[PDB]
Amino acid sequence: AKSRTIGIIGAPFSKGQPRGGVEEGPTVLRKAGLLEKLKEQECDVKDYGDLPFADIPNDSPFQIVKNPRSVGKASEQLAGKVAEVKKNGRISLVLGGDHSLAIGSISGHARVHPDLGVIWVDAHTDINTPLTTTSGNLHGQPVSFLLKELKGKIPDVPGFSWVTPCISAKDIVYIGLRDVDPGEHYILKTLGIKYFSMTEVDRLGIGKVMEETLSYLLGRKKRPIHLSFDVDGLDPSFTPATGTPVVGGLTYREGLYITEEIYKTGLLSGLDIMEVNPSLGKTPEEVTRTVNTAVAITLACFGLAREGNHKPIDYLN
Amino acid sequence: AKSRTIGIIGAPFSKGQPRGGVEEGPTVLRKAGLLEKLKEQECDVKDYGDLPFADIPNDSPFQIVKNPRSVGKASEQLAGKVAEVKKNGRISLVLGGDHSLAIGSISGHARVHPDLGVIWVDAHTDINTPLTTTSGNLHGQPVSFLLKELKGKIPDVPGFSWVTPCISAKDIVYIGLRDVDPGEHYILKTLGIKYFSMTEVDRLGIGKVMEETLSYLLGRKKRPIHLSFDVDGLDPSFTPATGTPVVGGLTYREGLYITEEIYKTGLLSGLDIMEVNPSLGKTPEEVTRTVNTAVAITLACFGLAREGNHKPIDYLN
Amino acid sequence: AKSRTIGIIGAPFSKGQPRGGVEEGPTVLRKAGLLEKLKEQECDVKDYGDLPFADIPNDSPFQIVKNPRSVGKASEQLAGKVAEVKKNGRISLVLGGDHSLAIGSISGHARVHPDLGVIWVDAHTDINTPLTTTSGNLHGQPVSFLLKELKGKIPDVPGFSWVTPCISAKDIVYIGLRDVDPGEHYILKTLGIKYFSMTEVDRLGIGKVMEETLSYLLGRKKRPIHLSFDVDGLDPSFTPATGTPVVGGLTYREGLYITEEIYKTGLLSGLDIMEVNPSLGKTPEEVTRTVNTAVAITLACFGLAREGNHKPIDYLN
Ligand SMILES: O=C(O)[C@H]1NC[C@@H]2SC[C@@]21CCC[B-](O)(O)O
Ligand SMILES: O=C(O)[C@H]1NC[C@@H]2SC[C@@]21CCC[B-](O)(O)O
Ligand SMILES: O=C(O)[C@H]1NC[C@@H]2SC[C@@]21CCC[B-](O)(O)O
Ligand SMILES: [Mn+2]
Ligand SMILES: [Mn+2]
Ligand SMILES: [Mn+2]
Ligand SMILES: [Mn+2]
Ligand SMILES: [Mn+2]
Ligand SMILES: [Mn+2]
- Mark whether C122 is an active-site residue: yes
Q: Any idea what DSSP says for residue B271?
A: E
Residue A109 labeled ligand binder: no
Q: How far is Cα B310 from Cα B308, in angstroms, rounded to an integer?
A: 7
Angle between helices A252-265 and A206-218 (to 10 degrees): 30
Q: Mind telling me how many Å the CA of A96 is from chain C's nearest CA? A: 26
Angle at C226 between CA C224 and CA C231, to 5 degrees: 155
What is the enclosing helix (H) or strand (E) of A8? strand A5-10
Question: Residue A66: CB within 6 Å of ligand 1?
Answer: no
Chain B residues within 8 A of C198 when measuring between CB atoms: 253, 256, 306
* Amino acid, res. C147: L
Q: What 3-state DSSP class applies to B173? A: strand
Angle at B195 between CA B190 and CA B199, to 5 degrees: 110
The catalytically annotated residue of C122, C171, C261, C272 is C122
Residues C85, C48 contacting (CB under 8 angstroms)? yes
Candidates A173, A282, A278, A268; CA nearest to A224 is A268
Question: Is residue C170 packed enough to be buried (19+ CB in 10 Å), middle (13-18) or exposed (0-12)?
Answer: middle
In chain B, where does DSSP find H-type helix?
25-31, 34-39, 68-87, 102-112, 142-146, 182-190, 198-204, 206-218, 252-265, 284-301
Q: What 3-state DSSP class applies to A257? A: helix
Which residues contact residue A223 at a Cβ distance below 8 angstroms, ignoring those fewer than 6 apart?
A115, A116, A117, A217, A267
- Its sign, for the CA torsion C139, C141, C146, C152, is negative
Q: Mind telling me how many Å the CA of A236 is from chain B's nearest CA? A: 15
Q: How many angstroms is it from B303 CA to the middle of ligand 7? A: 24
Q: How far is Cα B234 from Cα B255, in angstroms, rounded to an integer?
A: 7
Looking at the complex, does the CB of residue B212 fall below 8 Å from at least one CB of chain A? no
* Amino acid, res. C264: K
Q: In chain C, how long is the greatest CA-to-CA distance?
A: 69
Q: How far is Cα C254 from Cα C297, in angstroms, rounded to an integer?
A: 10
Q: What is the number of the ligand 2 atom nearest to the C-alpha of B142?
A: 16
Please report which ligand is nearest the Cα atom of B181. Answer: 2
Candidates A55, A146, A57, A35; CA nearest to A100 is A146
Q: Mind telling me how many Å the CA of C255 is from chain A's nearest CA? A: 10
In chain A, where does DSSP find H-type helix?
25-31, 34-39, 68-87, 102-112, 142-146, 182-190, 198-204, 206-218, 252-265, 284-301
Tell me if C309 and A185 make a contact (CB, 8 A cut-off): yes
Tell me if B198 and A315 make a contact (CB, 8 A cut-off): no
Q: Any idea what DSSP says for residue B122?
A: S
Residues A203, A244 contacting (CB under 8 angstroms)? no
CA A307 to each of CA A40, A258, A299, B209: distance values in angstroms, whole numbers, following the listed order: 17, 15, 14, 15
Q: What 3-state DSSP class applies to B79? A: helix
Q: Any idea what DSSP says for residue A100?
A: G
Q: Report, in angstroms and rounded to the nearest whole number, the Rg of chain C calculated over CA atoms.
A: 18
Question: Residue A128: CB within 6 Å of ligand 1?
Answer: yes
The catalytically annotated residue of B139, B184, B235, B254 is B139
The catalytically annotated residue of C59, C76, C126, C171 is C126
Q: How far is Cα C162 from Cα A308, in angstroms, rounded to an integer?
A: 65
Which residues contact residue A35 at a Cβ distance below 8 angstroms, ignoring those fewer than 6 apart?
A8, A45, A47
Looking at the complex, does the CB of residue C208 fall below 8 Å from at least one CB of chain B? no
Angle at A141 between CA A139 and CA A145, to 5 degrees: 125
Q: How far is Cα B95 from Cα B93, in angstroms, rounded to an integer?
A: 6
Q: Which residues sit opposite B225 in a β-bridge?
A: B117, B268
Question: Residue B133: CB within 6 Å of ligand 2?
Answer: yes
Q: How far is Cα B292 from Cα B273, in angstroms, rounded to an integer?
A: 12
Question: Residue B139: CB within 6 Å of ligand 2?
Answer: yes
CA C55 to each of CA A183, C69, C73, C163: distance values in angstroms, whole numbers, following the listed order: 51, 10, 10, 21
Looking at the complex, does the CB of residue B114 fall below 8 Å from at least one CB of chain C? no
Please report which ligand is nearest the Cα atom of C185. Answer: 3
Length of chain B: 317
- Mark whether C171 is an active-site residue: no
What is the enclosing helix (H) or strand (E) of C143? helix C142-146
Q: Mind telling me how many Å the CA of A214 is from chain B's nearest CA? A: 14
**β-strand C117-121 against C194-197: which pairing, if any?**
unpaired
What is the enclosing helix (H) or strand (E) of C76? helix C68-87
**β-strand C5-10 against C44-50: which pairing, if any?**
parallel
Angle at B281 between CA B280 and CA B283, to 5 degrees: 150
Question: Is residue C152 packed enough to be buried (19+ CB in 10 Å), middle (13-18) or exposed (0-12)?
Answer: exposed
Q: What is the four-CA torsion angle of C62, C64, C66, C67, rounded to 10 degrees?
A: 10
Looking at the complex, does the CB of residue A296 fall below 8 Å from at least one CB of chain C? no
* Amino acid, res. C265: T
**For the stretch B296-316, what's the b/e string if a residue is b when 16 or more beta carbons lie within 10 angstroms of its beta carbon?**
bbbbbbbbbbbbbebeeeebe
In chain B, count of helices (H) and strands (E)? 10, 8
Question: Residue A129: CB within 6 Å of ligand 1?
Answer: no
Candidates B299, B215, B205; CA nearest to B265 is B215
Q: How many angstroms is it from C128 CA to the middle of ligand 8? A: 11
Looking at the complex, does the CB of residue C198 fall below 8 Å from at least one CB of chain B? yes
Q: Is the peptide bond before B97 cis (omega within 30 degrees of 0)?
A: yes
Residues B87, B80 contacting (CB under 8 angstroms)? no
Residues B13, B23 contacting (CB under 8 angstroms)? yes
The catalytically annotated residue of B50, B76, B98, B126 is B126
Interface of C with A in 254-283 (CB under 8 A): 254, 256-257, 260
Question: Is residue B284 packed enough to be buried (19+ CB in 10 Å), middle (13-18) or exposed (0-12)?
Answer: exposed
Residue A222 CB coordination number (10 Å): 12
Among protein residues, the one whose CA lies closest to atom 12 of ligand 2: B140
Neighbours of chain B (3+ CB pairs under 8 A): A, C
Show binding-site residues of B for Mn(2+).
99, 122, 124, 126, 230, 232
Q: What 3-state DSSP class applies to B125? A: coil
Q: Which residues sit opposite C174 in a β-bridge?
A: C120, C195
Candidates C193, C227, C192; CA nearest to C301 is C227
Among protein residues, the one whose CA lies closest to atom 13 of ligand 1: A140
Q: How far is Cα B13 from Cα C4, in angstroms, rounded to an integer?
A: 63
HEC readout, A68-95: HHHHHHHHHHHHHHHHHHHHCCCEEEEE
Question: Is residue A35 packed enough to be buried (19+ CB in 10 Å), middle (13-18) or exposed (0-12)?
Answer: middle
Residue B283 CB coordination number (10 Å): 10
Q: Report, in angstroms and rounded to the nearest whole number, the Rg of chain A calculated over CA atoms.
A: 18
Q: How many angstroms is it from C244 CA to the middle of ligand 9? A: 6
Residues B61, B135 contacting (CB under 8 angstroms)? no
- Protein residues placing their CB within 5 Å of the ion ligand 6: B 122-124, 230, 232
Q: What is the number of the ligand 1 atom nearest to the C-alpha of A124?
A: 15
User: How was it solved?
Assistant: X-ray
Which residues contact residue C58 at a Cβ distance below 8 angstroms, ignoring those fewer than 6 apart?
none
Q: How far is Cα B163 from Cα B146, in angstroms, rounded to an integer?
A: 8
Q: Any idea what DSSP says for residue C91?
A: E
Which residues contact residue C122 at a Cβ distance below 8 angstroms, ignoring those fewer than 6 apart?
C99, C174, C175, C176, C177, C228, C229, C230, C232, C233
Pocket test for ligand 2, best of B22, B71, B126, B290 (most atoms within 8 A of CB): B126
Residues C272, A152 contacting (CB under 8 angstroms)? no
Angle between helices A102-112 and A68-87 (to 10 degrees): 30
Q: What 3-state DSSP class applies to C139? A: helix
Q: What 3-state DSSP class applies to A216? A: helix
User: For A148-151, which contacts have Cβ atoms below 8 Å and span 24 or more sequence positions?
Assistant: A149/A191, A150/A187, A150/A191
What is the enclosing helix (H) or strand (E) of C70? helix C68-87
Looking at the complex, does the CB of residue C203 fall below 8 Å from at least one CB of chain A? no
Q: Report, in angstroms and rounded to the nearest whole number, the Rg of chain B calculated over CA atoms.
A: 18
Candidates C210, C195, C200; CA nearest to C253 is C210
Chain A residues within 8 A of B248 when measuring between CB atoms: 251-253, 256, 306
Find the discontinuities in chain B where C to next N exceeds 2.5 angstroms and give the residue preceding each: none
Q: Resolution in A, one decimal?
A: 2.0
- Mark whether A124 is an active-site residue: yes
Residues B120, B111 contacting (CB under 8 angstroms)? no
- Chain B: residue whose CA lies nearest to A237: B237
- Mark whether C139 is an active-site residue: yes
Q: How far is Cα A252 from Cα A266, in angstroms, rounded to an integer?
A: 22
The catalytically annotated residue of A122, A171, A184, A235 is A122
Candidates A254, A240, A232, C258; CA nearest to B251 is A254
Residue B54 CB coordination number (10 Å): 9
**DSSP per-residue string spanning B33-52:** THHHHHHTTT-EEEEEEEPP
Q: How far is Cα A67 from Cα A19, in angstroms, rounded to an integer?
A: 13
Neighbours of chain A (3+ CB pairs under 8 A): B, C
Q: How many angstroms is it from A234 CA to the middle of ligand 7? A: 29
Residues C129, C64 contacting (CB under 8 angstroms)? no
* Amino acid, res. B264: K
Candidates B109, B186, B100, B87; CA nearest to B140 is B100
- Mark whether B122 is an active-site residue: yes
Q: Any idea what DSSP says for residue B139?
A: G
User: For B78-81, which contacts have Cβ atoms below 8 Å and span 24 or more sequence positions?
Assistant: B78/B9, B78/B11, B78/B51, B78/B104, B78/B105, B78/B108, B79/B103, B79/B104, B79/B105, B79/B107, B79/B108, B79/B111, B79/B162, B80/B108, B81/B9, B81/B48, B81/B51, B81/B108
Looking at the complex, does the CB of residue B190 fall below 8 Å from at least one CB of chain A? yes
CA C253 to each of CA B181, B307, C305: distance values in angstroms, whole numbers, following the listed order: 34, 22, 12
- Mark whether C109 is an active-site residue: no
> Residue A9 — left, alpha, or beta (φ > 0 → left; ψ -120 to 50 → alpha)?
beta
Q: How far is Cα A300 from Cα A247, in angstroms, rounded to an integer?
A: 24
- From the candidates C212, C264, C285, C307, which should be mutated to test the interface with A, based on the most A CB atoms within 10 A? C307
Among protein residues, the one whose CA lies closest to atom 7 of ligand 1: A124
**β-strand A268-274 against A225-230: which pairing, if any?**
parallel
- Chain C: residue whose CA lies nearest to B202: C205
Residues A6, A42 contacting (CB under 8 angstroms)? no
CA C47 to each of CA A217, C50, C140: distance values in angstroms, whole numbers, following the listed order: 49, 9, 28
Angle between helices B206-218 and B252-265 (to 10 degrees): 30
Residues A154, A174 contacting (CB under 8 angstroms)? no
Residue A244 labeled ligand binder: yes
Helix-, strand-, coil-residue percentages of chain C, each rounded to 5? 40, 15, 40
**DSSP per-residue string spanning C207-276:** HHHHHHHHHHHHSSS---EEEEEEGGGB-TTT--SSSS--SS-B-HHHHHHHHHHHHHHT-EEEEEEE--
What is the enclosing helix (H) or strand (E) of C28? helix C25-31
Which residues contact residue C31 at a Cβ distance below 8 angstroms, ignoring those fewer than 6 apart?
none
What is the enclosing helix (H) or strand (E) of B93? strand B91-96
**DSSP per-residue string spanning C153-211:** TS---TT-TT----B-GGGEEEEEE----HHHHHHHHHTT-EEEEHHHHHHH-HHHHHH
**β-strand B44-50 against B91-96: which pairing, if any?**
unpaired
Q: How many angstroms is it from B10 CA to the middle of ligand 6? A: 19
Q: How far is Cα B17 from Cα B277, in angstroms, rounded to an integer?
A: 11
